[PDB]
Design a protein around this ligand. Structure first.
Ligand SMILES: CCCCCCCCCCCCCCCCCC(=O)OC[C@H](COP(=O)(O)OC[C@H](N)C(=O)O)OC(=O)CCCCCCCCCCCCCCCCC
Ligand SMILES: CCCCCCCCCCCCCCCCCC(=O)OC[C@H](COP(=O)(O)OC[C@H](N)C(=O)O)OC(=O)CCCCCCCCCCCCCCCCC
Ligand SMILES: CCCCCCCCCCCCCCCCCC(=O)OC[C@H](COP(=O)(O)OC[C@H](N)C(=O)O)OC(=O)CCCCCCCCCCCCCCCCC
Ligand SMILES: CCCCCCCC/C=C\CCCCCCCC(=O)O[C@@H](COC(=O)CCCCCCCCCCCCCCC)COP(=O)([O-])OCC[N+](C)(C)C
Ligand SMILES: CCCCCCCC/C=C\CCCCCCCC(=O)O[C@@H](COC(=O)CCCCCCCCCCCCCCC)COP(=O)([O-])OCC[N+](C)(C)C
Ligand SMILES: CCCCCCCC/C=C\CCCCCCCC(=O)O[C@@H](COC(=O)CCCCCCCCCCCCCCC)COP(=O)([O-])OCC[N+](C)(C)C
Ligand SMILES: CCCCCCCC/C=C\CCCCCCCC(=O)O[C@@H](COC(=O)CCCCCCCCCCCCCCC)COP(=O)([O-])OCC[N+](C)(C)C
Ligand SMILES: CCCCCCCCCCCCCCCCCCCC(=O)O[C@H](COC(=O)CCCCCCCCCCCCCC)COP(=O)(O)OCCN
Ligand SMILES: CCCCCCCCCCCCCCCCCCCC(=O)O[C@H](COC(=O)CCCCCCCCCCCCCC)COP(=O)(O)OCCN
Ligand SMILES: CCCCCCCCCCCCCCCCCCCC(=O)O[C@H](COC(=O)CCCCCCCCCCCCCC)COP(=O)(O)OCCN
Ligand SMILES: CCOc1cc(CC(=O)N[C@@H](CC(C)C)c2ccccc2N2CCCCC2)ccc1C(=O)O
Ligand SMILES: Nc1ncnc2c1ncn2[C@@H]1O[C@H](COP(=O)(O)OP(=O)(O)OP(=O)(O)O)[C@@H](O)[C@H]1O
Ligand SMILES: Nc1ncnc2c1ncn2[C@@H]1O[C@H](COP(=O)(O)OP(=O)(O)OP(=O)(O)O)[C@@H](O)[C@H]1O
Ligand SMILES: [K+]
Lengths: 96, 360, 148, 346, 50, 331, 56
């Protein structure tokens, strides 16, 4: 028989049905949102770290567009805490 | 580690019996491999060759086998490499001589007009291609220039002579004339003069005659001897039923070629009911002569598998007698029309003749 | 597997996003490199699925052979037949080992090619970032994030 | 290159790597590195001046091309069993060696000193050519084809000649051992048709379960002869495996350690690249100039951002090839252990 | 959770410590980002040597 | 010594001629001798021919300038026949420029003296003749196909096994190149010191041997290796070869001559090989070689000459055909 | 010495036939001339080689 092209199904339907008829709606959306939120924090922590070693190398609540802070510790510790908490939430959601 | 690496080395589990998996292996799509293709170009792949440089030893023969695009590139690379290498030599010798830094001084240049490497490259072109503009002469000053001039001239003449020889052997190539020899796509088995024979048609398209044509013919079947031998592809020779037995033939109009199936033929036990596609048989035809213009010998190769054969059909007559001369209507070259024939084997026909003829 | 797959692919997307942001001329060369990456992923998955099924269906008869040989040990040794079965095991072991070797070699093929692609990314990122920080004055902070 | 489009011999050819094959490639690799070092130095030097000064890197720039073409020529003459044609390569090494020996000594006479990197690079590259030359005459000694009357020609490996052998990793050129280039052709087969026990085929001699079992029995018998211990403890089996696979387990560890050490050069390169990129200080590369040519020293060479970025790229290549080299050796030894131990249990 | 939190927690502790309890430099990107890359290459074998 | 071979396994023969009345034909065939010579020797003669011609005419150009006296310093009271000749080395460079036809033109030929005009004509004609001759020799050398004969490969040693009842002397011949050999031909000869009843003695009698072809011809179409055998009929001189009589000093040798015009250059080539007395394995059929792969065949040249043992009587062909005939008659 | 088109045509004769009078040389000024010189020499030699073979 000829199935060289047929074999490469990639199982996309087998996954759509899986998530739908097994996970529901609430938890699948929570999983995706939690993963993206944690990864955006990683982007944010690297972006904030870069701008900090940049400006500090001799009203600051804003994450971006603000360069009026002698010390960047307050926002950087908060970003680290967000990353830890989101890792916990992401792990729980995936396993549950 | 992002990869799924954890504590699970055991992999101990019991799986039930599994049978009949879905896989693309129900049927073998690939057919029986052709021993030589319909345009020559035999479809046999050598393997496990213990190379010893014999391919590379005969560079000249290797150059001839190359296509014209690659031959032109090697032609170009050979000249360019020699030209540029000696350009460095001329540039370096002038630079070492010190006649490259300009000035109104006591020094007299060994090679005049050399100012940069560009002039050295142009001077190399002039010397080896014998253009000889003469604005960049060779003077009497440094004898090493005279030695290098002799070396460059000898090397240039040798490379020119070698490439000439290669081009003369490549413009005499007749592998593009052998492709105008035409064999009918499918051959037939049909009775002539009461004896069965394996007919065929071969014709020439151009007007330049091929001298001393020679039509051989071989049957390619796996053979198991009574002694038990195992020959995967045995090649049995085949006659041509010519009036003198010899393989020679004079081909102007497309002639009919047929192997009279006598008692000593390997086709002698073939029946139309066993002429399906997956039958291990093949008929090769070898039309070799010398082309009258180039004088170079040529071969034409064609093959006829089992499914290509067409039992009990006769080729359509092609030649006619028109006003000025004969005509050849090539549109009817491969047309076959069915003829009333027995379905018996050659040996079955022989048995029928053995009894019917001996009426008394 | 879902946690690891999603985190890995999203880390890759996040990392490529940051590299593009630091040096805008990276993404222009990313597109030809992304096409090459697509081909490598495509061909590897086709090869890896086949070798994975082969590995599974080759290791099943080996444990089955061990179990059945321990079931009928006395009968096998009665015939003095054990030379034949040792040859059968060697063929089974060789079949199992060659399936594993080809799976590992396919894995190493992918890893070497992907890490060379990553090395090309590093050179593109480093070269363009230094050039952009000697003309456009990237301020030397995005340079550090891009390199790491 | 042209003829290979019209030949089928190399479709399933048979190779014979000349004596001194493994260290020939590594010498070409290390000198391909110290030619990029000369390129980097030359580009670094001439830029501070106002002219070209092409003689700094163009010699190195063409030496780099010459080395690549040399290894390609050597490989093409290694797949075929035709040693005669490497006479050009044999004369090439000494032709470059003598000329660069003159360059090295004519740096010393002018008191160049090791303080300048170009002197160190030239000196390093001189022995890198001399040792390569010594390999090019070692081939003569073992095959005896140029001058010696009767050559001592050698047959190709016996395991390669089976048509049921297709995992040809153990016998292939060193660079394709590392980058698994030979796998690429097989991958197309996997996409074309499925991969059954037909596509893959019998494993080489060294990986056959009987060969590993024979090596294991030899190790056990040798151990029992050297030490006469009545019990066969768990340590007896442990030393047996070590004595049967030590000459490969050490190779895996060596490759892994070198990969780790070169891997840490990535972070360290990042440190240097960013640290130099501070305050946009004016370039002051040349300190000790000689005869109108700016010589770059060690720290000056490794203070340049572009030089360090290129150096980082080369370091990543070495790291990520040695790491994969370690992985394959570990897997091959582990799979051989499975074969020998499954046979021993049976 | 532990695998993905020990790098960030170590990085958090490291940066805060140098700024407050060390004050041995100005925390230039050459040191900050080099140490960040070192933490990545060290976390991978540290979490798996167990 | 042990046993002289007529032709060596590589194809070169070993016959040594002696007491030849040299008539100069070896020297007379200058062009044929050049073609036979090796490329290093051909290049040496190529270089020496041109260098001698260049230097010979260079001396003539120097001689005519010296005789004309135009090489000594002059101030307008003279016009040299060959311009800018103020040294012998100038004349040497001028000779190079003329014969090679580089023609730099710094050392011209003026209209003044006619002798230089005649010498220019002679040098041009001689240069064209030598260029044409070297072209001819190089064209014949680049058209050589003796190196093609090397790619033709025979079995290490031949066998004699029963096939289709009767006995035949088998053999295998293969081609390694992808190119074809048009109009191939396989001759086969036995070389034995054959004595005759009438009293004659022949030191090496060469008996021709049929190829056992289908149509009784010498044509062979050689693409894959072929088991080219010879049916040992009654008339075949191999009809009385005892397997016990196969030892070293058995006066036997099987010449083989594979001919056929090479398609590329159009040149015919011979392949030669001799099977000695002890280089024959009785009753061992050849290993099947031509395998089949997906949609194409495959020849395993690793098993080119391997022969497996097949049972067969250890009897002379005369003791076999006669015995079989008697059994059939009795039955 | 390139003044009119006829000068360029005669220069083409001198290069391809390899007569090379030398009154119209090629200097180091424009590199494209050197590339065109290489092209014309190779093409002229190839055409000459082919015509030689056909004449033979
Ligand atoms: C790659 C160069 C190798 C040679 C380097 C110089 C060696 C000088 C040899 C002088 C004789 C002394 C020792 C003899 C060595 C013989 C070598 C040789 O024959 O191989 C040359 C090869 C292959 O031939 P083969 O199959 O080996 O020959 C039969 C062999 N005797 C046998 O065992 O059966 O023949 C071929 O297959 C064709 C090779 C032609 C090479 C031409 C290269 C391109 C040159 C273009 C640029 C010109 C450069 C000019 C520089 C001038 C500088 C002043
Ligand atoms: C399946 C293929 C796989 C790929 C392998 C080859 C790759 C080729 C790529 C395909 C496209 C090629 C287009 C080339 C166009 C220019 C060349 C040209 O005109 O010659 C093309 C033709 C030959 O064609 P062919 O079909 O190969 O020949 C038929 C025969 N059966 C054979 O193959 O043989 O030539 C002739 O029929 C001979 C005429 C010769 C006259 C040429 C004179 C001038 C040549 C150019 C010289 C100047 C070069 C300048 C270089 C400058 C460098 C600085
Ligand atoms: C001075 C400045 C230099 C700075 C950089 C330095 C870099 C130096 C590199 C040097 C490495 C030297 C190690 C050489 C030995 C290699 C291993 C080796 O010999 O084992 C070979 C093994 C398998 O062997 P086998 O045939 O089955 O067994 C042997 C025999 N049976 C026995 O008796 O035992 O098979 C294998 O080993 C499997 C393959 C793994 C090897 C792959 C490594 C290739 C590196 C690729 C680098 C790519 C490009 C780098 C360029 C850098 C510069 C431009
Ligand atoms: C398609 C090509 C035709 C030419 C294209 C023109 C482009 C280059 C032009 C040029 O300046 O040439 C240079 C090429 O000199 C080098 O760069 C030397 C390189 C040596 C290696 C050459 C072999 C490869 C000439 O450099 P030079 O001869 O060193 O200059 C003379 C010095 N002087 C002017 C002070 C007297
Ligand atoms: C740090 C570098 C040290 C070497 C480490 C790696 C190489 C180990 C030695 C080695 O390969 O031995 C070689 C001898 O070749 C020699 O070793 C002889 C070379 C002598 C030169 C002396 C220079 C001083 C073995 O011979 P080969 O033919 O190279 O083996 C090819 C094996 N293959 C075909 C299975 C792939
Ligand atoms: C391959 C050669 C090129 C390299 C040559 C290097 C040596 C230089 C030789 C030389 O100067 O020749 C000299 C002689 O020379 C002879 O008489 C040569 C004798 C041998 C020639 C025949 C060899 C066979 C030059 O002789 P001339 O120039 O006649 O001397 C008068 C010069 N004057 C007119 C300026 C006063
Ligand atoms: C044998 C023959 C050459 C022609 C003989 C007559 C000479 C005059 C040619 C002529 O003026 O051609 C002209 C066009 O002409 C072309 O460009 C023609 C190109 C094709 C010519 C052959 C096919 C007709 C070229 O003109 P020009 O040389 O650019 O003119 C520059 C003016 N000046 C000469 C005053 C500086
Ligand atoms: C820094 C790292 C750089 C590494 C570059 C060096 C690797 C060189 C290996 C090249 C190689 O083996 O491939 C060749 C490519 O040949 C060709 O394609 C023909 C040569 C044309 C180029 C000149 C010959 O191998 P092959 O393709 O001929 O393989 C069939 C063999 N008979
Ligand atoms: C091929 C083998 C690998 C090549 C590696 C080259 C790396 C050389 C190190 C420095 C480097 O990349 O140089 C930059 C690239 O310049 C160039 O590529 C052009 C250099 C032109 C000569 C000056 C120029 O940047 P830079 O700072 O080195 O010098 C600026 C002049 N002022
Ligand atoms: C990053 C460093 C730059 C190197 C990039 C190219 C890597 C390829 C390495 C060369 C290589 O695998 O050599 C041969 C492939 O040749 C080839 O086919 C040459 C392709 C190279 C493309 C450039 C393998 O030859 P082998 O011994 O595996 O097979 C020969 C029997 N046909
Ligand atoms: C079939 C098993 O054959 C293999 C065997 C190996 C060797 C190997 O390192 N394993 C574990 C490590 C230990 C802790 C289990 C691992 C797994 C996933 C990702 C990285 C890693 N290590 C990477 C280097 C630093 C430590 C973490 C690799 C790859 C393969 C492969 O499928 O080709
Ligand atoms: N040793 C030899 N070397 C070369 N040619 C020979 C030799 N012996 C004989 N020939 C040639 O054989 C022919 C005659 O041989 P034969 O010995 O029978 O007569 P002959 O007396 O030598 O002849 P003639 O008087 O013609 O020379 C002549 O063509 C002669 O050149
Ligand atoms: N794979 C091959 N590729 C090329 N030539 C081969 C190959 N196999 C055998 N030959 C050639 O066939 C002849 C002998 O073949 P065979 O393998 O039967 O014996 P052998 O042991 O290789 O012989 P020898 O010692 O003469 O080389 C030799 O001329 C040999 O070069
Ligand atoms: K000229």
């Amino acid at each position: 028989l000829s199935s060289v092209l047929h074999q490469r199904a990639k199982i996309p339907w087998r996954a759509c049905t899986k998530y739908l008829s097994s996970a529901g709606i609430l938890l699948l959306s929570l999983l995706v949102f939690s993963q993206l939120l944690k990864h955006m924090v990683l982007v944010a922590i690297d972006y904030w770290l870069a701008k900090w070693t940049d400006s500090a190398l001799v009203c600051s609540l804003s994450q971006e567009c603000d360069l009026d802070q002698s010390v960047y510790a307050m926002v950087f510790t908060l970003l680290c805490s967000l990353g830890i908490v989101l890792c916990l939430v992401t792990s729980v959601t995936v396993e549950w | 580690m992002l990869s799924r690496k954890g504590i699970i080395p055991e992999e101990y589990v019991l799986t039930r019996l599994a049978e009949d998996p879905t896989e693309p292996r129900y049927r073998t799509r690939e057919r029986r491999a052709r021993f030589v293709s319909k345009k020559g170009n035999c479809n046999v792949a050598h393997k496990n060759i213990r190379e010893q440089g014999r391919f590379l030893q005969d560079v000249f023969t290797t150059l001839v086998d190359l296509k014209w695009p690659h031959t032109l590139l090697i032609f170009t690379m050979s000249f360019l490499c020699s030209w540029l290498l000696f350009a460095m030599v001329w540039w370096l010798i002038a630079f070492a001589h010190g006649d490259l830094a300009p000035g109104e001084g006591t020094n007299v240049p060994c090679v005049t007009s050399i100012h940069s490497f560009s002039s050295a490259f142009l001077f190399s072109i002039e010397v080896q291609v014998t253009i000889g503009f003469g604005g960049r002469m060779v003077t009497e000053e440094c004898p090493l220039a005279i030695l290098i001039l002799i070396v460059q001239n000898i090397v240039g003449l040798m490379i020119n002579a070698i490439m000439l020889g290669c081009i003369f052997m490549k413009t005499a190539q007749a592998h593009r004339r052998a492709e105008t020899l035409i064999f009918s796509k499918h051959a037939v088995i049909t009775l002539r003069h009461g004896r069965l024979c394996f007919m065929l048609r071969v014709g020439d398209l151009r007007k330049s005659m091929i001298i001393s044509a020679t039509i051989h013919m071989q049957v390619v079947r796996k053979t198991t001897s009574p002694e038990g031998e195992v020959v995967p592809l045995h090649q049995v020779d085949i006659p041509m039923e010519n009036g003198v037995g010899g393989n020679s033939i004079f081909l102007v109009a497309p002639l009919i070629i047929y192997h009279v199936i006598d008692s000593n033929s390997p086709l002698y036990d073939l029946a139309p009911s066993d002429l399906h596609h997956h039958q291990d048989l093949e008929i090769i035809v070898i039309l070799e002569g010398v082309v009258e213009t180039t004088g170079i010998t040529t071969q034409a190769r064609t093959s006829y598998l089992a499914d290509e054969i067409l039992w009990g059909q006769r080729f359509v007559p092609i030649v006619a007698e028109e006003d000025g001369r004969y005509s050849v209507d090539y549109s009817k070259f491969g047309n076959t029309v069915k003829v009333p024939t027995p379905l018996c084997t050659a040996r079955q026909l022989d048995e029928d003749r053995s009894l019917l003829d001996a009426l008394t | 597997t879902l946690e690891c797959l999603s985190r890995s692919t999203l880390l890759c997307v996040s990392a490529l996003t940051v590299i593009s942001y630091v040096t805008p001329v990276f993404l222009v060369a990313l597109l030809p490199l992304a096409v090459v990456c697509y081909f490598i992923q495509k061909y590897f998955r086709v090869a890896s699925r086949d070798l994975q099924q082969l590995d599974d269906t080759t290791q099943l008869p080996l444990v089955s052979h061990f179990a059945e040989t321990v079931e009928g040990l006395t009968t096998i040794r009665a015939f003095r037949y054990e030379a034949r079965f040792q040859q059968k095991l060697l063929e089974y072991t060789d079949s199992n080992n060659i399936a594993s070797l080809f799976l590992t070699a396919a894995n190493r093929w992918l890893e070497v090619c992907m890490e060379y692609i990553g090395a090309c990314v590093v050179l593109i990122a480093a070269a363009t970032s230094i050039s952009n920080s000697l003309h456009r004055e990237l301020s030397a902070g995005l340079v550090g994030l891009g390199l790491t | 290159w042209g003829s290979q489009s019209s030949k089928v011999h190399i479709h399933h050819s048979t190779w014979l790597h000349f004596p001194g094959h493994n260290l020939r490639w590594i010498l070409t690799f290390i000198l391909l590195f110290v030619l990029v070092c000369e390129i980097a130095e030359g580009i670094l030097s001439d830029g501070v001046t106002e002219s070209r000064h092409l003689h700094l890197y163009m010699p190195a720039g063409m030496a780099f091309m010459a080395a690549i073409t040399s290894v390609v020529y050597y490989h093409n003459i290694e797949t075929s069993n035709f040693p005669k044609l490497l006479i050009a390569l044999l004369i090439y090494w000494t032709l470059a060696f003598i000329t660069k020996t003159i360059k090295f000594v004519k740096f010393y006479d002018h008191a160049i000193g090791f303080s300048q990197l170009r002197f160190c690079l030239t000196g390093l590259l001189v022995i890198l050519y001399g040792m390569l030359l010594l390999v090019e005459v070692n081939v003569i000694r073992v095959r005896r084809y140029i001058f010696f009357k009767t050559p001592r020609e050698v047959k190709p490996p016996e395991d390669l000649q089976d048509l049921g052998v297709r995992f040809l990793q153990p016998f292939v050129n060193l660079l394709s051992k590392g980058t698994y280039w030979w796998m690429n052709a097989f991958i197309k087969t996997a996409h074309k048709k499925p991969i059954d026990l037909r596509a893959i085929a019998k494993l080489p001699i060294a990986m056959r379960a009987l060969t590993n079992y024979q090596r294991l029995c030899v190790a056990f018998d040798a151990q029992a002869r050297k030490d006469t211990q009545s019990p066969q403890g768990a340590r007896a089996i442990w030393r047996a495996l070590c004595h049967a696979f030590g000459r490969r387990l050490i190779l895996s560890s060596t490759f892994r350690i070198l990969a780790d050490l070169l891997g840490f050069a990535g972070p360290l390169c990042i440190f240097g690249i960013v640290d130099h990129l501070g305050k946009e200080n004016h370039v002051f590369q040349p300190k000790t100039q000689f005869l109108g040519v700016y010589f770059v020293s060690s720290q000056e060479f490794l203070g340049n951002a572009y030089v360090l970025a290129v150096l980082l790229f080369l370091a990543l290549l070495l790291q990520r090839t040695f790491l994969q080299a370690s992985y394959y050796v570990a897997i091959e030894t582990g799979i051989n252990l499975r074969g020998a131990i499954q046979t021993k249990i049976y | 959770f532990m695998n993905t939190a020990i790098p960030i927690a170590a990085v958090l502790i490291t940066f805060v410590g140098h700024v407050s309890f060390f004050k041995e430099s100005d925390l230039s990107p050459s040191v900050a980002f080099a140490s960040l890359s070192l933490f990545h290459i060290l976390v991978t074998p540290l979490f798996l040597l167990s």
